[PDB]
Each structure stands twice: as structure tokens, then as C-alpha cells.
Amino acid sequence: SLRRGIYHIENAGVPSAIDLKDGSSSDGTPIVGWQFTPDTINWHQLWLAEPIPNVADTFTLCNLFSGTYMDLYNGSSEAGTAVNGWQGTAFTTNPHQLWTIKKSSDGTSYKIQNYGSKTFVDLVNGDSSDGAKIAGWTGTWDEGNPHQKWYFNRMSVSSAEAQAAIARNPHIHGTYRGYILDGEYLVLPNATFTQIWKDSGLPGSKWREQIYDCDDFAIAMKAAVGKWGADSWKANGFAIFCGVMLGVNKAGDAAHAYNFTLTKDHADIVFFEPQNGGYLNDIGYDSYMAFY
Amino acid sequence: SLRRGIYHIENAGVPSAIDLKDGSSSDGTPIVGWQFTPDTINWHQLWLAEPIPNVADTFTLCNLFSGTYMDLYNGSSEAGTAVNGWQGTAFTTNPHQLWTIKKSSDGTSYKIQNYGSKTFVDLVNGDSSDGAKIAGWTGTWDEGNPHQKWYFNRMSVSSAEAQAAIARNPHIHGTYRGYILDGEYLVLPNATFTQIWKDSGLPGSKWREQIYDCDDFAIAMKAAVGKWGADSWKANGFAIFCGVMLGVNKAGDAAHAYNFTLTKDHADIVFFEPQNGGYLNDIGYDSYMAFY
Ligand SMILES: C[C@@H]1O[C@@H](O[C@@H]2[C@@H](O[C@H]3O[C@H](CO)[C@H](O)[C@H](O)[C@H]3O)[C@@H](O)[C@@H](CO)O[C@H]2O)[C@@H](O)[C@H](O)[C@@H]1O
Ligand SMILES: C[C@@H]1O[C@@H](O[C@@H]2[C@@H](O[C@H]3O[C@H](CO)[C@H](O)[C@H](O)[C@H]3O)[C@@H](O)[C@@H](CO)O[C@H]2O)[C@@H](O)[C@H](O)[C@@H]1O
Ligand SMILES: OC[C@H]1O[C@H](O[C@@H]2[C@@H](O)[C@@H](O)O[C@H](CO)[C@@H]2O)[C@H](O)[C@@H](O)[C@H]1O
Ligand SMILES: OC[C@H]1O[C@H](O[C@@H]2[C@@H](O)[C@@H](O)O[C@H](CO)[C@@H]2O)[C@H](O)[C@@H](O)[C@H]1O
Ligand SMILES: OC[C@H]1O[C@H](O[C@@H]2[C@@H](O)[C@@H](O)O[C@H](CO)[C@@H]2O)[C@H](O)[C@@H](O)[C@H]1O
Numbered sequence: 117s118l119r120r121g122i123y124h125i126e127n128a129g130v131p132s133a134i135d136l137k138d139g140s141s142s143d144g145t146p147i148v149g150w151q152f153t154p155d156t157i158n159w160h161q162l163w164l165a166e167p168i169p170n171v172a173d174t175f176t177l178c179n180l181f182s183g184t185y186m187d188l189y190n191g192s193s194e195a196g197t198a199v200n201g202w203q204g205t206a207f208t209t210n211p212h213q214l215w216t217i218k219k220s221s222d223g224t225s226y227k228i229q230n231y232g233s234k235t236f237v238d239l240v241n242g243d244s245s246d247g248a249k250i251a252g253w254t255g256t257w258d259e260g261n262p263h264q265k266w267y268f269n270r271m272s273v274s275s276a277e278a279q280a281a282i283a284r285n286p287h288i289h290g291t292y293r294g295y296i297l298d299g300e301y302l303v304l305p306n307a308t309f310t311q312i313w314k315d316s317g318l319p320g321s322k323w324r325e326q327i328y329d330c331d332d333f334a335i336a337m338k339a340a341v342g343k344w345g346a347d348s349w350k351a352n353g354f355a356i357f358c359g360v361m362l363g364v365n366k367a368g369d370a371a372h373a374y375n376f377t378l379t380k381d382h383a384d385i386v387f388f389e390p391q392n393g394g395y396l397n398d399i400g401y402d403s404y405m406a407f408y
Numbered sequence: 409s410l411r412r413g414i415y416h417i418e419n420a421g422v423p424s425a426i427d428l429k430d431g432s433s434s435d436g437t438p439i440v441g442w443q444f445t446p447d448t449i450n451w452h453q454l455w456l457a458e459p460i461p462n463v464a465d466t467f468t469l470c471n472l473f474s475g476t477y478m479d480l481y482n483g484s485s486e487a488g489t490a491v492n493g494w495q496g497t498a499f500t501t502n503p504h505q506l507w508t509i510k511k512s513s514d515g516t517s518y519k520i521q522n523y524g525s526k527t528f529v530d531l532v533n534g535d536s537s538d539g540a541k542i543a544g545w546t547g548t549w550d551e552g553n554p555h556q557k558w559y560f561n562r563m564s565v566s567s568a569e570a571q572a573a574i575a576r577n578p579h580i581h582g583t584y585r586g587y588i589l590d591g592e593y594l595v596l597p598n599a600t601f602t603q604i605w606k607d608s609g610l611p612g613s614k615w616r617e618q619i620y621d622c623d624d625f626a627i628a629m630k631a632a633v634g635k636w637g638a639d640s641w642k643a644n645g646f647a648i649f650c651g652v653m654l655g656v657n658k659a660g661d662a663a664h665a666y667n668f669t670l671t672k673d674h675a676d677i678v679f680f681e682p683q684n685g686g687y688l689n690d691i692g693y694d695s696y697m698a699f700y
């Protein structure tokens with residue numbers, strides 16, 4: 117079962133992602149195949165998959181940027197029927213916006229079936245060009261046809277996953293306590309994490325004893341990532357990953373406040389120094405408290 | 409012994425405060441008597457008293473706004489010698505900027521003696537007018553003369569004091585843990601706390617599930633108060649009081665994130681709801697974690 121989360125959905129035959137054209141929130145905006153850049157935010161190509169209660173392997177798919185939903189036009193089972201962005205809600209009963217998502221016969225990619233029509237999401241002709249039509253099409257669950265197979269590249273972590281990555285880290289103090297604030301988090305490439313840091317004004321901030329010292333830099337970075345998230349995305353039901361940590365050095369006589377993010381494989385944390393933009397596997401401190 | 413801290417220093421004969429004229433950072437800016445408004449930030453009238461190591465009852469006095477120091481002009485013991493703001497440092501050995509501060513014979517107000525000259529800070533003639541000269545003057549430790557007596561009205565809390573106020577509160581969960589970030593904090597009137605909230609843009613922020621929910625409002629308020637502190641005051645060695653709390657309701661099935669401040673008498677906390685600007689003695693939650 118596909119987990120609740122944010123996905124970049126990539127065709128299995130050609131390197132085209134499921135893209136809501138121009139990120140537009142208009143009803144009837146085409147969903148199309150489009151090329152992508154790895155290790156970036158692909159602004160029109162992120163999809164929040166929300167499981168429907170008691171309806172096995174079935175989801176709404178909400179574009180993270182537009183807040184509108186993947187919609188099979190009038191629910192038609194006719195092959196070639198347009199797939200578009202359309203207004204909706206996370207737990208809608210409109211079958212046009214409900215999608216059963218299960219592993220394909222290659223066991224890695226998925227097929228995406230409309231719950232009402234029983235047709236599948238199809239990159240028409242396998243066309244690799246930017247703006248290629250995606251449509252609902254006749255098919256089967258087991259066939260090999262790559263036009264209807266899709267890698268769900270997971271871009272978020274659950275809170276349990278984030279906690280797991282922290283608990284793997286060797287620089288955690290014995291007295292550590294962690295405070296979880298949300299449920300599901302977009303993990304940022306470092307290029308983006310750094311951009312938010314730059315755009316916050318923190319690179320220009322001077323360290324000043326107590327009035328703007330390490331704890332202020334760290335809390336300000338976290339607030340800047342929270343503001344970026346709300347100002348950047350129209351969908352709801354997720355947060356952006358940026359932690360704050362307090363830590364103590366090995367001698368026990370100095371403490372520090374700093375940020376952390378997650379590795380690209382989502383398995384480990386990496387520390388960020390908000391006073392200079394540096395990423396570190398070892399910041400010189402063991403964390404006694406985190407919130408994220 | 410006067411404690412390290414921030415003080416509003418008020419003459420004992422007439423309701424004039426020790427005021428650095430126009431808040432100016434220029435060397436030789438006059439320090440004068442001036443009227444004040446209670447329960448406000450008196451922008452030119454706050455003084456950070458820093459104890460000198462191993463020199464009993466002796467301090468520098470740093471104006472919070474200008475970052476310059478109370479200075480007896482050329483250290484002269486002549487009565488009438490100007491007291492002005494002047495560049496310096498917190499632990500200076502320049503006796504012009506060193507002040508022995510001890511209780512007067514009324515046991516409540518203090519006298520302020522220059523360490524080099526042995527003369528006292530004097531509101532000349534007891535003049536109550538705005539801009540009245542303050543000078544160094546001959547005197548004694550024990551006399552009653554109100555021209556040389558000063559109420560040190562304490563405007564900050566230590567971290568121990570803040571912790572004490574939290575521990576007095578009845579809405580603290582059994583599992584509570586508190587994380588202290590700084591050492592000495594300016595306590596804000598609510599009028600100012602509210603102003604910072606308004607100026608942060610938070611009153612216009614919409615609640616959104618996970619992406620801008622209670623935890624984001626609370627962290628954003630705290631960051632806005634930290635930015636205000638640095639952008640507002642030139643002195644260093646103190647912070648501004650604004651806490652974040654996470655709490656749980658009595659049924660144990662809902663949690664919330666919010667802010668808190670201190671009462672005017674510095675003895676108790678008051679909760680602030682950053683989603684609507686309200687102050688509450690009981691927010692409906694018991695705090696399991698705080699940072700401040
Ligand atoms: C927000 C916008 O994003 C980029 O343009 C999108 C575009 O993005 C994809 O394709 C480009 C090449 O055209 C790169 O591979 C990106 O890595 C992709 O994410 C598509 O999403 C189309 C169609 O919806 O819309 C464009 O706006 C970027 O090129 C823009 O400068 C801008 O940052
Ligand atoms: C920053 C500035 O503050 C106020 O003017 C100060 C003034 O403030 C004191 O006296 C006024 C009346 O003149 C009120 O009692 C205030 O409550 C006091 O804090 C003095 O500090 C003088 C001399 O240094 O400078 C003025 O700038 C206020 O009146 C201004 O509007 C402004 O907010
Ligand atoms: O058009 C507004 C509606 O949009 C969604 O439903 C429609 C559906 O009623 C039908 O017109 O088909 C279109 C295209 O397939 C949409 O699925 C919402 O689910 C409705 O609540 C309503 O907003
Ligand atoms: O047209 C019927 C078939 O449709 C699906 O496959 C085709 C594929 O063979 C190629 O013609 O391209 C189109 C559009 O891209 C479809 O992917 C089913 O997968 C086949 O089983 C059959 O129904
Ligand atoms: O003028 C710059 C200096 O200011 C302070 O000391 C002077 C002192 O040397 C003498 O000129 O008297 C004036 C007025 O009383 C000041 O106290 C600093 O302490 C010096 O470091 C220097 O900056």
C-alpha cells in the first residue's frame with residue numbers, strides 16, 4: 117500500500133513527470149508529461165496522496181502548488197479522456213477524483229486507476245515531449261505497458277520516519293528529548309533549504325550576546341521555513357521539514373542552538389549552522405532537545 | 409546588593425526618571441530628569457546594570473537603547489559635574505563609568521556613587537521639569553536628601569525568576585520540561601507584546617492544517633519578538649521575554665501550541681493565543697514543554 121505522502125510521479129518508460137500545466141489552479145488545467153531536474157523542488161510536479169477511509173488502496177491526489185485535484189474529465193471510461201486539475205477536497209466522494217494506486221507487475225512502479233471508470237493514467241504514446249497528453253485509457257493491472265506505469269518517488273517523511281533518522285544519529289545526548297509538531301513533512305533539497313536561509317536575511321544578522329545569539333538564529337530559520345511553506349503551497353495537510361536542536365559539547369561546559377534537515381535518502385539527519393549556512397555531519401555538540 | 413538587570417530609575421522626591429536625552433548615542437549626550445508613562449516601554453530611560461567582578465556593589469550602567477554608558481565628565485569630584493552618555497564597555501576599568509549603587513537610609517531607594525570621584529548622582533534642585541540637569545554632587549550615604557535618592561524599578565527577570573513564575577502556575581502538566589535559552593529578560597507590557605504581534609503580520613495569517621497551524625503561529629510570534637529585540641536596542645547582554653508552550657487538554661486527546669508572557673509584578677505567567685491576540689489566565693491546556 118502506497119503510504120500517505122507527497123510524491124513526484126515519474127513515467128517508467130521515459131523520464132517525464134506528472135505535471136499540472138503552469139501550476140494553474142483553474143478547473144480543467146491539463147495534466148501533462150514534463151521533464152524534471154533531480155534534487156530540486158519541481159514546482160508543478162508534487163502530489164499529496166491522501167488515503168480514503170475504508171476504501172482499500174484509493175486516494176485523492178492533490179497538486180501541492182495549486183491545491184487542485186487530479187480529475188478524470190466527467191469520469192468517462194473512453195480511452196483518451198482528459199486528466200486535469202480540478203477543484204475538490206481531500207476526502208471527496210466524487211469518483212472523478214478518486215484513484216486506486218497499486219504496484220504494477222514490475223513490483224516497483226505503480227498503476228493509477230480511476231475508481232469510477234476503472235481506466236488507467238496513461239502517458240499517451242509514451243511521448244517524452246514536454247506537454248504530452250496524459251489521459252485515462254483502457255488497460256489491465258498486470259500488463260507491462262510502460263505508458264501506464266509510474267514511479268512514486270517519495271518526497272516527504274512521516275513524523276515516525278523523521279524520529280527514526282534522528283535516533284540513528286550518533287550525536288544525540290543521553291538526556292535527549294524530541295518534540296513533534298506535525299505529521300508529514302516535505303523534505304527539502306539543501307539548495308532550497310539554503311535559499312530560504314538567504315531569503316530570511318539571516319546571512320546579514322550579527323551575533324550579539326543574548327539579544328541575537330545562537331538560539332535566535334535557529335528559531336528564526338525555523339520560522340522562515342514555516343513562512344515559506346505557507347506562502348509557497350496552496351495544498352494543506354503537510355508541513356516543511358526544518359528542526360531546531362539544543363546541544364552540549366563533549367566537555368559538558370558549552371551549549372549551542374542550531375538547525376537540522378534530512379539526507380536525500382531520508383534515512384539520516386544533517387546539521388545546519390544558521391549563523392553561516394554550513395551543513396555538517398558533526399556540529400561539535402550532542403543534542404539534548406529538538407523540536408520539528 | 410542590586411541584582412544584575414534592567415532598571416527604570418526614578419527620583420525619590422519627584423516622578424522624574426533618569427533619561428539619556430533623545431536616546432542619542434553621541435558621546436557627551438546629557439543625562440537628564442524626564443517624566444514617564446507606567447506600563448509602557450520608556451525608550452530612553454532603561455539601564456542595564458552589569459556587576460563588576462570582585463568590586464563590591466559596583467556596576468556599569470548601559471542605556472538599553474543607545475548602548476552607551478553613564479559617564480561622569482572627566483571624573484571630576486566638583487559638584488555640578490555633568491553626567492552624560494559615553495562610549496564604553498560592560499566591564500571597563502574607566503572609573504568615570506563605574507558606579508557603586510547601595511540602599512539609601514530609607515532602605516528602599518538607592519544612592520548612586522561614582523567609584524572614582526565618590527560623588528553622587530543628583531537631580532539638581534529636585535527640579536521636576538523635563539530635561540533637568542543631572543550632575544555628580546557632594547553627599548553622604550546616610551542623608552535624607554531626595555535629590556540623590558533613586559528607585560531602581562526592575563524591568564527584567566533572570567532565567568531563575570522566569571522558571572519560578574512558571575512553577576507557580578497551576579496549568580503545568582506532570583511531564584513538563586522547560587528549556588532555558590538566555591539569562592536575563594526584558595519583560596514587556598502587554599501593550600507592547602500585542603504591538604509586536606500586530607507588526608509581525610500574524611493577525612492576518614489563516615490557520616491551515618499542518619502547513620500553518622498552531623505550532624507555526626507560536627514559533628512565528630517568538631521569532632518576531634526576537635527580531636524586535638535586536639532591531640530595537642543597541643545594548644547587548646539581555647534577551648526579550650516571550651515563551652513558547654506545547655500543552656494537552658484535560659481529556660488527554662488534543663494538544664495545542666501557544667505563547668506566554670509574565671505579569672507586571674513578574675511573579676506569574678499569562679498565556680497568549682497567537683491566532684487571535686488574546687491573553688488568558690487559563691488557555692484550556694496544561695503545558696508539557698516550554699522554551700523561552
Ligand atoms: C516555477 C517554474 O518552474 C520551472 O518551469 C516550470 C516547468 O518546470 C519543469 O520543467 C523545467 C523545464 O521546462 C525543468 O525541467 C524543471 O526542473 C521542471 O520542474 C514545468 O513545470 C512547466 C509546465 O507546468 O511550467 C514551468 O513553469 C522553471 O523552468 C521556471 O523558471 C520557474 O522556476
Ligand atoms: C521614542 C519616543 O519616546 C517618547 O518621547 C521621548 C521621551 O519619552 C518620555 O517622555 C514622554 C513625554 O515627553 C513620555 O512621558 C514618555 O512615556 C517618556 O518615555 C523622552 O525620553 C525624550 C527625552 O529623551 O525623548 C523623546 O523622544 C514619545 O513621546 C515619542 O513619541 C517616541 O515614541
Ligand atoms: O465544477 C465544480 C465541481 O467540481 C468537482 O466536480 C466536477 C463534477 O461535478 C463534474 O462536473 O465533473 C467535473 C470534471 O470531471 C468535476 O469532477 C467537485 O468535486 C465539485 O464539488 C464541484 O466543485
Ligand atoms: O488501445 C488499447 C490498448 O491500450 C493500452 O495500451 C495502449 C498502447 O498499446 C499504445 O497503443 O498506446 C496507448 C496510449 O498510450 C495505450 O497505452 C492497454 O494497455 C492495452 O492493454 C490495450 O487496452
Ligand atoms: O572618548 C573616547 C573614550 O571614551 C571613554 O573614556 C573617556 C575618558 O578617556 C575621558 O576622555 O573622559 C571621557 C568623559 O568622562 C570618557 O570617560 C572610554 O572609556 C574610552 O575607552 C574611549 O572610548
Ligand SMILES: OC[C@H]1O[C@H](O[C@@H]2[C@@H](O)[C@@H](O)O[C@H](CO)[C@@H]2O)[C@H](O)[C@@H](O)[C@H]1O
Nearest residue numbers: 530531532533534545546547548553555
Ligand atoms: O551643596 C552641598 C550639599 O549638597 C548636597 O545637597 C544639595 C541640596 O542641599 C540642594 O542644595 O540641592 C543640591 C543640588 O540638587 C544638592 O542636592 C549634599 O546632599 C549635602 O550633604 C551638601 O553636601
Ligand SMILES: [Ca+2]
Nearest residue numbers: 297298621623
Ligand atoms: Ca501541528
Ligand SMILES: [Ca+2]
Nearest residue numbers: 326329590647
Ligand atoms: Ca537569545
Ligand SMILES: [Ca+2]
Nearest residue numbers: 329331589590
Ligand atoms: Ca542564549
Ligand SMILES: [Ca+2]
Nearest residue numbers: 298355618621
Ligand atoms: Ca505546523
Ligand SMILES: [Cl-]
Nearest residue numbers: 258259260261
Ligand atoms: Cl504485458
Ligand SMILES: [Cl-]
Nearest residue numbers: 259260261262
Ligand atoms: Cl503491455
Ligand SMILES: [Cl-]
Nearest residue numbers: 550551552553
Ligand atoms: Cl538627612
Ligand SMILES: [Cl-]
Nearest residue numbers: 551552553554
Ligand atoms: Cl539631607
